[PDB]
Amino acid sequence: GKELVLALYDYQEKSPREVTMKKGDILTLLNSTNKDWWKVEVNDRQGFVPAAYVKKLD
Numbered sequence: 001g002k003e004l005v006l007a008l009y010d011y012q013e014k015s016p017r018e019v020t021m022k023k024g025d026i027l028t029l030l031n032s033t034n035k036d037w038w039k040v041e042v043n044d045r046q047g048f049v050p051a052a053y054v055k056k057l058d
Contacts, residue, residue, distance in 0.1 A: 003029035005040065005054035019047025027054065 007025040011018075021027055021042050030046055031039035037048040 001028075002041070003032060004057035005029045005038075006057055007049075007053060008055055009053040011050050011053055013047070015048075017048050019043070019045045019049065021049055023053075026057065029054070029056075 005027050007021050007023055007027055010021065010023045012020045018037070019042055021040075025042070027049065028041040029038055030041050032051075036051050038051045038054065039046060040049050042049070
């Protein structure tokens, strides 16, 4: 569908654009385009997460 990632480590936002996510989470990755702050659909929000702490499922 979109892209998906397995969360390798947790993360907690530092900004309204960033969102929190938890280690193990199958996130729905929305924009890998940014390279570094990848945008994903997570919980209820289309927010930024560190590209570091995620691994492409697809």
